[PDB]
């Protein structure tokens, strides 16, 4: 159910080499809140990769602490997938957390590296969130 305390979801960004704007995945519900993968180019140069939580809500009373593993899938060999962990208290003023320089753009888009195929790159997030505050009273 959406009240689950954790989950793993993926989002495949197409026409990756041409990415120019920030892109958002559909939501994955955890602790009944919508979580999304956010990817954006940073300085070509580097891949920006962030985890976003409950960003569309106009509430300013909510908060949810969570730890997560942000990973860029290596389709040729999963042991080569690259990941970084985060731990953050998400709330309206800090609704996303991650790395602007998650990986070098040149490396992720390198066809010989195994992360890109048909100009597509798959992002994955394993999020373990605590019970939120200021949502369901």
């Amino acid at each position: 159910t959406s009240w689950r305390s954790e989950a793993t979801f993926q989002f495949t960004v197409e026409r990756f080499s041409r990415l120019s704007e920030s892109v958002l995945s559909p939501p994955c519900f955890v602790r009944n809140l919508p979580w999304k993968i956010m990817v954006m180019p940073r300085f070509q140069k580097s891949v920006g990769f962030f985890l976003q939580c409950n960003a569309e809500s106009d509430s300013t009373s909510w908060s949810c602490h969570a730890q997560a593993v942000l990973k860029i899938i290596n389709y040729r060999d999963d042991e080569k997938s690259f990941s970084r962990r985060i731990s953050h208290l998400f709330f309206h003023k800090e609704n996303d957390w991650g790395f602007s320089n998650f990986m070098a753009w040149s490396e992720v888009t390198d066809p010989e590296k195994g992360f890109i195929d048909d100009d597509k790159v798959t992002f994955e997030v394993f999020v373990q969130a605590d019970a939120p505050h200021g949502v369901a009273w």
Binding site: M40, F50, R84, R85, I86, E94, W97, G98, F99
Partner: peptide
């Protein structure tokens, strides 16, 4: 994992 932050 090297200094996580907001977008």
């Amino acid at each position: 994992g090297a200094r996580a932050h907001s977008s």
